[PDB]
Amino acid sequence: KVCEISGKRPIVANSIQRRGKAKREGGVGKKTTGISKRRQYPNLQKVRVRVAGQEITFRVAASHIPKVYELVERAKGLKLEGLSPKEIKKELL
Amino acid sequence: VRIKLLLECTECKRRNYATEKNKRNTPNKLELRKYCPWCRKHTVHREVKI
Amino acid sequence: PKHGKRYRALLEKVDPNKIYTIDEAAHLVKELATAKFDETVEVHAKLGIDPRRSDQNVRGTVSLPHGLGKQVRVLAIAKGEKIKEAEEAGADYVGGEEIIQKILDGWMDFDAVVATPDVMGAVGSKMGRILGPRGLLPNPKAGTVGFNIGEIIREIKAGRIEFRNDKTGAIHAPVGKASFPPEKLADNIRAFIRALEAHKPEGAKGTFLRSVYVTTTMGPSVRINPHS
RNA sequence: CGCGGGGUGGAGCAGCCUGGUAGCUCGUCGGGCUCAUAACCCGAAGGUCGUCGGUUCAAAUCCGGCCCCCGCAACCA
RNA sequence: AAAAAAUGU
RNA sequence: UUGCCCGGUGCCGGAAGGUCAAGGGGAGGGGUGCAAGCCCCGAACCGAAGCCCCGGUGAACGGCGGCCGUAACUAUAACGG
RNA sequence: CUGGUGUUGGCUCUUGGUCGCGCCUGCGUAGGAUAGGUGGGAGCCUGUGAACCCCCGCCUCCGGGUGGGGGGGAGGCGCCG
RNA sequence: GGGGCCUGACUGCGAGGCCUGCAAGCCGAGCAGGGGCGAAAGCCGGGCCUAGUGAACCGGUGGUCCCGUGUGGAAGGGCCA
Known part of the structure; x- marks a missing residue:
């Protein structure tokens, strides 16, 4: 759905089907036999973490993974101990 | 046409062209012959393929 | 052992x-050329060109700078008045019309064998289905077919030798003895590598000299430098 | 288009990397063994080894190059 | 442990 | 009670090879620069399923013709080709 | 359906196709034996050790071939046949 | 019908008309350039002639005075075949 750290979501995108010689190659150019509506997805994965004594997971996009780890880092030097797992999340920046 | 074939000519000292035809089979092969050239003029001519 | x-x-x-x-192959083969006879140079150069394809059919001739130091009994069919210009050019036998009748029934090898461009309608069947092993047969390429024949003799009798290529693009051609000094084994190895990268087949691929070695008589190579 | 692969008796198929024989059958013809027939059993007619160019001492064969088939993947102003 | 091995106006 | 045929097709198996995308890979070429360079193409080969091929399968889709020759005053032909 | 990657990290074992190089390898039958081609070619190898035993290293179309070591004592091999 | 030399089966054009809806289809003196046969007048812009073929739109090769995105060049176009 929605990558929580980066925010990247699903943007409309296309499916270009085309048969014929690449102009620069053989010649005559390349025709299109179709185009269609698809949907692109963020390579989100799942990741848990300590932080307080409560395991809180995150729906982060792939390449934004060692990021949360950077959050759990600065996270420490902070007013943490409130057993609100709920609250534990959004808090972090 | 088929065996006949589409022939082009050269200015045996450069480029130039004329264009007529062979007949691979029947007494043929190797095509050199005089013809007057545009790029200056007074030579003979080769064969090739394009 | x-x-x-x-x-x-x-x-x-x-x-x-x-x-x-x-230099160090004209330097150190004066230390590798160990023996009691005068050794020459065995400068090969297996080319990179292909062998079976005619689009890379190597074949030239090299005039060494200071010579083999090794004589060479080169004759000549010679035909006409050049019957007399191949004997005032450095040669033992020259022009007699047909000496393909005395040289028929046993031979102990002399050295070079040539014939002019007009008697090449009757020079490939007599002793040309005979002297070809030791490839001495007359042809319009290797430097053995021309009316000036005696001039093809006066230069081979100065330090020249004949080169080309065998059943595997393998190249050999003599710089000279092991008796020629510092500038004398290098003045004839390089000048000789000036008629190979120049006769280089246009449809061949990669460096034309796959590996260059300067070796004396029966013995140990000196993996040499192709540029210096 | 390209990588392959393939054509040799009247049809069938080995000889295809090895060079050196043109064969293995079906089928017609004779001739063998029995007491005769059958059935097995032999020797032959017959193929530019598709074509032409070629290196060899010599080619179906290795080289060439194209006509021609069939597989695929691709090309179609 | 005589492979199979037909008939005969 | 449910026969004959797995050639094609589907399907299940299977591989010695054919072919085949991305990608890897870098031989060699080229565009420029006074050059370091930056760029483009990019030959060998390695690269899946797939289809070709190999076996199997009918209570899988389907199919299950013919036309010579053979017996007695013809016909017919279990018979064989 | 599947191949490349992302998520994706530890531990050995094993094989490639490569290519770096030291430089080591090859037998149908007829044969005395394991003859890759075509030239050189009547003589080299030994006192910087031969014939034969021995060991292990490598290869095997398991007969047989190759090199180092270590013994010894002065013998080996090749045209020709 | 046969024989000798040769290549005009030219390029650069084309007054002038046949037909005709377009557009295409067809004839061509003569000039210039440089040739061929020819003693020469001369003849030759393929074949005794009417069928032997298919607009453009995209594109491949050659050629080249041309355009070349700030500037020099390339990428890619134009045009002649």
Whole structure:
């Protein structure tokens, strides 16, 4: 759905089907036999973490993974101990 | 046409062209012959393929 | 053991992991040329061109700078008045019309054998289905077919030798003895590598000299430098 | 288009990397063994080895190059 | 442990 | 009670090879720069399923013709080709 | 359906196709034996050790071939046949 | 019908008309350039002639005075075949 750290979501995108010689190659150019509506997805994965004594997971996009780890880092030097797992999340920046 | 074939000519000292035809089979092969050239003029001519 | 006690100290001096030149290979084969007869140079050069394809059919001639130091009995069919210009050009036998009748029934090898461009309608069947092993047969390429024949003789009798290529693009051609000094084994190895990268087949691929080695009589190479 | 692969008796198929024989059958013809027939059993007619160019001492064969088939993947102003 | 091995106006 | 045929097709198996995308890979070429360079193409080969091929399968889709020759005053032909 | 990657990290074992190089390898039958081609070619190898035993290293179309070591004592091999 | 030399089966054009809806289809003196046969007048812009073929739109090769995105060049176009 929605990558929580980066925010990247699903943007409309296309499916270009085309048969014929690449102009620069053989010649005559390349025709299109179709185009269609698809949907692109963020390579989100799942990741848990300590932080307080409560395991809180995150729906982060792939390449934004060692990021949360950077959050759990600065996270420490902070007013943490409130057993609100709920609250534990959004808090972090 | 088929065996006949589409022939082009050269200015045996450069480029130039004329264009007529062979007949691979029947007494043929190797095509050199005089013809007057545009790029200056007074030579003979080769064969090739394009 | 595996070779001449005379042969061995010829290698422990030529490291194969050291790039010698036409200097340290004209320097050190005066230390590898160990013996009691005068040895020449065995400068090969297996080319990179292909062999079976005619689009890379190597074949030239090299006029060495200071010579083999090794004579060469070169004759000539010669035809006409050049019957007399191949004997005032350095040669033993020249022009007699047909001496393909005395040279028929046993031979102990002289050296060079040539014939002019007009008697090449009757020069490939007599002793040309005979002298070809030691490829001495007359042809319009290797420097053995022209009316000026005596001039093809006066230069081969000066330090010239004949080159081309065998059943595997393997190239050999003599610089000269092991008797020629510092500038004398290098003045004839390089000048000779000036008629190979120049006769280089246009449809061949990669460096035309796959590996160059300067070796004396029966013995140890000096993996030389192709540029220096 | 390209990588392959393939054509040799009247049809069938080996000889295809090895060079050196043109064969293995079906089928017609003779001739063998029995007491005769059958059935097995032999020797032959017959193929530019598709074509032409070629290196060899010599080619179906290795080289060439194209006509021609069939597989695929691709090309179609 | 005589492979199979037909008939005969 | 449910026969004959797995050639094609589907399907299940299977591989010695054919072919085949991305990608890897870098031989060699080229565009420029006074050059370091930056760029483009990019030959060998390695690269899946797939289809070709190999076996199997009918209570899988389907199919299950013919036309000579053979017996007695013809016909017919279990018979064989 | 599947191949490349992302998520994706530890531990050995094993094989490639490569290519770096030291430089080591090859037998149908007829044969005395394991003859890759075509030239050189009547003589090299030994006192910087031969015939034969021995060991292990490598290869095997398991007969047989190759090199180092270590013994010894002065013998080996090749045209020709 | 046969024989000798040769290549005009030219390029650069084309007054002038046949037909005709377009557009295409067809004839061509003569000039210039440089040739061929020819003693020469001369003849030759393929074949005794009417069928032997298919607009453009995209594109491949050659050629080249041309355009070349700030500037020099390339990428890619134009045009002649």
